[PDB]
């Protein structure tokens, strides 16, 4: 009577939900995708630019927020929902992440290394079901080809989500408190992957 | 509610300076030589520089300030914005610099050696970002081709800015107090450099 089902998605649900937005990006001109990622990479390095871009989807701007805008706007803008909405869904995700994670997302964009973390986070989400239960995981990141150890980017991304990380087994221990941010990280990495290329 | 943020990055500063700079790169190379002739004299004479400021805020003037004016009004004589505004932006910047720096800028003009300290000041600005935080920089001026020790032109330029300077590492330490003058100095060097070609 109070609602039609459970509170929490499974990974397949989360994957499905992000994939519909991701397909609208996957079907776009490679020229436009190159321009957005160039801007988004910049916006992820400047938290103030990020705030401006978001405020601006609620007239031209300077800098990275302005560049992103120009991939979503007619002359005279005239914001176009079919492009602007996907970027709103990404920007929403990014509000759950730390500044540190944004910069790593920037670094991942520049070095064009998004599929490694995507596959890591993605696979931790899938194996962590059900997300409400704390659990230790057999999965070691290094054996998928990521750098691993306290300084590594994959480490920091996951540390900022709130997982407890070891340099030896168990490498990853799932904390239900990290649900929000891993799901937002997965979504951010996936949306950014849809643009480039792939 | 109360739109952006206070301080720019070097990229913003460089963009803003380049707007003015490109309109000097457009002008005919006869007038550019005439103008740097007078500007060199105006940098060596503080009283003349103030008369040039005041003249632009036009009756003629004697001397170095008169030379610059005759490149911005003639042979009418009333002010031509398209030439005057650039000289006004340079004169604005020069207000933030000391009498000592003005002379060094005169020296750099006459020697035609502006790109060295432009590239020095330029590179320290780009690296010291964010400007409001104190930090030690590993950039050594000597390995950019500039003279470097207590008496050298490049050194004094930066000392007058408020930076703390070593003959040995750390060679330059960024004081956030030096912001105003470094941006002044950088913009003055760039404007002067754009007239020179290069």
From Swiss-Prot, chain A:
- Region annotation (Linker helix loop) ranges: 1-20
Annotated site residues (Cleavage) in this chain: 14-15
Q: Which residues carry this modification: S-(2-succinyl)cysteine?
A: 33, 183
Q: What is the effect of changing residue 7 to A/R?
A: Constitutively active mutant; promotes activation of pyroptosis
Q: Where in the cell is it found?
A: Cytoplasm, Cytosol
Q: What is this protein called?
A: Gasdermin-D, C-terminal
Mutating residue 89 to D has which effect? Spontaneous pyroptosis-inducing activity
- Classification of source organism: Eukaryota, Metazoa, Chordata, Craniata, Vertebrata
